[PDB]
Each structure stands twice: as structure tokens, then as C-alpha cells.
Amino acid sequence: AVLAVRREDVNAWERRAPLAPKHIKGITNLGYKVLIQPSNRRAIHDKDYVKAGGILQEDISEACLILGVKRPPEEKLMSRKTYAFFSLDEILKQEIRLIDYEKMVDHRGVRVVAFGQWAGVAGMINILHGMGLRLLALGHHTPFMHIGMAHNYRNSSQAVQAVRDAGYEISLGLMPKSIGPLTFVFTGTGNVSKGAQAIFNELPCEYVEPHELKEVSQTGDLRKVYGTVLSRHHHLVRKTDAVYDPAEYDKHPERYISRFNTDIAPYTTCLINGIYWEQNTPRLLTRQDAQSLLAEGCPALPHKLVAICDISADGSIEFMTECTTIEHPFCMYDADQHIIHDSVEGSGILMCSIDNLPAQLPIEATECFGDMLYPYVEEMILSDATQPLESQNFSPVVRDAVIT
Numbered sequence: 001a002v003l004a005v006r007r008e009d010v011n012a013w014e015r016r017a018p019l020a021p022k023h024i025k026g027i028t029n030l031g032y033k034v035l036i037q038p039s040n041r042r043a044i045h046d047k048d049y050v051k052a053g054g055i056l057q058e059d060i061s062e063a064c065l066i067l068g069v070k071r072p073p074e075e076k077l078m079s080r081k082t083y084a085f086f087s088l089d090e091i092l093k094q095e096i097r098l099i100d101y102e103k104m105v106d107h108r109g110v111r112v113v114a115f116g117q118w119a120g121v122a123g124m125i126n127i128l129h130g131m132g133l134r135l136l137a138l139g140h141h142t143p144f145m146h147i148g149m150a151h152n153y154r155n156s157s158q159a160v161q162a163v164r165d166a167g168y169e170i171s172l173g174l175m176p177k178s179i180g181p182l183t184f185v186f187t188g189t190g191n192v193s194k195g196a197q198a199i200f201n202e203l204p205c206e207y208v209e210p211h212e213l214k215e216v217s218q219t220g221d222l223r224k225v226y227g228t229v230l231s232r233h234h235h236l237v238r239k240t241d242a243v244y245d246p247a248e249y250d251k252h253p254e255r256y257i258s259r260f261n262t263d264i265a266p267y268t269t270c271l272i273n274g275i276y277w278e279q280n281t282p283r284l285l286t287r288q289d290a291q292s293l294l295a296e297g298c299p300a301l302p303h304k305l306v307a308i309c310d311i312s313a314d315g316s317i318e319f320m321t322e323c324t325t326i327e328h329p330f331c332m333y334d335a336d337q338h339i340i341h342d343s344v345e346g347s348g349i350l351m352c353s354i355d356n357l358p359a360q361l362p363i364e365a366t367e368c369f370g371d372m373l374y375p376y377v378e379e380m381i382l383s384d385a386t387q388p389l390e391s392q393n394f395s396p397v398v399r400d401a402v403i404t
């Protein structure tokens with residue numbers, strides 16, 4: 001009846017953990033022994049887990065349940081243990097049980113163990129930092145220059161203070177007037193969209209309805225930034241009669257299109273995309289839409305759309321084919337329909353599509369992930385990869401999450 005948190009080795013930038021010291025304290029209070037594999041890579045220091053009752057050892061063969069952020073590869077995986085991770089044949093010989101956090105879903109079917117809003121919180125900070133660089137490359141110093149990447153801050157609190165400081169400069173009228181008012185569009189309904197809005201709320205922001213973007217993008221107060229939250233009924237219409245039936249779209253999305261390209265996109269400065277996109281879902285923007293959207297000392301912007309940030313890792317933007325890295329976060333989409341990875345001064349739209357956004361705020365990501373995983377840890381400690389799964393007293397959340 002021993003638990004172990006293994007060290008991450010998949011990536012040099014994987015600084016998260018499946019549990020925080022607060023969760024190790026609660027598990028040790030139940031009487032369970034917790035082993036902590038040493039890791040200079042983790043954002044939360046080893047001694048914080050030791051202060052919470054965790055024992056730090058390099059050998060975790062004593063444990064029955066071994067928790068990790070990503071799946072252990074080849075030799076590191078050993079027999080007669082129960083593992084859990086994100087992401088056959090010889091499983092039965094080695095008698096090991098593998099659990100995938102992604103498969104932990106409730107009766108409704110929505111995932112219970114995720115990273116929550118922190119992909120959106122980090123994405124909003126990154127795209128605000130990216131707009132500062134992109135607008136300066138176009139010849140405009142803005143308060144967005146005083147916002148760094150999400151991983152340059154100890155936590156979201158420190159990042160919020162930087163966003164509020166830059167927002168104060170905007171309220172003082174220090175924005176260049178020639179580029180006009182800035183409009184931000186939030187798509188999607190998940191927690192990542194709410195996390196992006198949480199950062200946006202620290203600016204001198206004003207929320208408007210999607211139909212107001214056309215007027216707001218022309219006459220908006222230059223001491224403010226403007227945002228709108230896009231719902232399905234704002235842009236999805238039937239191909240035949242332009243009617244929106246919410247139940248019909250949820251069953252037959254192939255009967256609908258998106259007027260985002262004509263109704264919203266021409267009046268959008270920055271698009272924060274958190275859309276859940278399936279293969280037969282109407283696309284938000286096509287390649288031809290991008291071609292149409294791109295056509296003295298205080299000059300205006302070449303095009304209204306400055307940048308796009310993908311915070312849900314999800315084909316709705318046709319020309320956002322490739323992904324980016326925390327070290328190289330931004331790329332450009334040229335009017336020649338080419339992807340430029342480092343030419344922020346080039347022609348086009350700034351684009352950001354980092355796949356490990358929560359890893360930029362790994363402390364709070366570890367705590368939020370650990371808060372979701374905590375109510376299922378004890379039943380996973382009592383797991384016996386030797387005994388059959390039917391004998392184990394698993395909740396349907398954990399039982400369905402077993403991939404072996």
C-alpha cells in the first residue's frame with residue numbers, strides 16, 4: 001500500500017507533476033506511504049514534497065501505484081505495478097495495470113481529470129506578448145511590449161500584475177492612435193476559454209455583443225480594449241435558409257456553415273480560439289478567407305487581424321496546420337500562403353499554437369490537476385495489478401480508464 005510519484009523524462013520542459021505537496025499531505029494523513037522520485041525538472045521543489053510527508057528515493061520498486069504526467073517508456077516501466085499517465089500484449093505476462101487520465105470520464109462523458117483553465121490563461125498572456133512584438137515590428141510601440149511569455153512569471157498572480165500594469169498604460173492613453181481600437185474574439189465554451197477571459201479582464205476591457213464589433217472596431221475608445229465571446233448561434237447558419245437550430249447542429253453539423261469570415265473576422269484584431277472542432281464541423285476560416293483579409297510616421301495597420309492564438313489544440317482554422325513550441329511560440333502566415341517560423345516582421349498573421357500550454361504555469365497546473373485527481377487516488381493505491389480488475393473496487397471513472 002505504497003504510492004510513488006515518478007520523475008518526468010519525456011521532455012526537458014515538462015515541469016508538471018500529477019500531484020502537489022498539498023495532496024501528498026492528505027494521502028500521508030490517511031496512513032499511506034508516498035515515495036517521491038527526485039527531479040530537478042519539476043517546478044515544485046523536492047523539499048516541498050518532503051515537508052508534506054513525502055519520502056524521496058531513487059528506487060520506487062516498493063510502491064504499488066506509480067503516478068506520472070506522461071507514460072513511462074520501455075525499460076523504465078516495470079512489472080507487478082499499477083501505473084497512471086497521459087498519452088499492450090505483454091501486459092498480462094508482467095501483470096501491470098495502466099490507467100489513462102484522458103479516459104477518466106463521468107456518466108455524462110466529460111473528462112474529470114484535466115488541466116482546466118491554465119491552457120487558456122497561458123495562451124492569453126502569450127498572445128498579448130506576441131502582439132507587442134508584432135505591433136513593434138510593424139512600427140508601433142505599445143504597452144503590450146511590457147508583457148512577457150507565460151513561463152517568464154512565477155505564477156499567474158505575477159503575470160496578472162504585469163497585465164494590469166500594461167492595462168494601466170492603455171487607460172492612460174499611451175496606445176498609438178493610428179492603429180485604432182483593438183478587438184479580441186473568444187471562441188469555445190470550455191475552461192480554457194474562461195482562463196483566457198480571466199487574463200483579458202485585467203485590461204481596461206469592455207465586452208460587447210458580436211454584432212457591435214463592426215462599430216466598435218471603428219469608433220472604440222482608444223483607452224480601452226474590446227472583447228466579445230462568440231457563441232454558436234452568433235455565426236452558425238443553415239446552408240438552405242440560414243436558420244440556427246441548436247439541437248440539429250449538435251446532430252448534423254454538415255448542414256451548417258460559418259459566417260465568422262464575413263460577420264466577425266474583418267473586425268477582429270486578435271482571435272483566441274478554444275473551439276471543439278470535429279471533422280464535419282464548419283470551419284471558422286479558410287485559406288481564401290485569409291487571402292481576402294490581407295489586401296506616415298503614425299501609420300495604420302495593414303490588416304485588422306493581427307494575431308490568432310490556439311488555446312484548445314483543436315482544424316477549424318484551415319491555415320493553422322503546424323504547431324509551435326514554448327521556445328519558438330510564434331509563426332507567420334503569409335499572403336503567399338507560406339508559414340514563416342521566425343519572421344515576425346514578415347507579411348501576414350501572427351499565429352501561436354503551443355501544445356504544452358499548461359506547462360508554462362506548471363505550479364498551478366500541478367495543483368489544479370492534482371485537485372481533480374485526488375478523489376480517485378486512494379482507490380488506485382489499493383489497486384492490485386495481480387488480482388483481476390473485476391475484483392478491484394474501482395469507481396466506473398477509474399475502471400473505464402484502464403487501457404489494459
Ligand SMILES: *[C@@H]1CC(=O)N(CC)C1=O
Nearest residue numbers: 115116117191368371372
Ligand atoms: C480544478 C482546477 C480547474 O481549472 N477546475 C475547473 C474549474 C477544477 O475543477
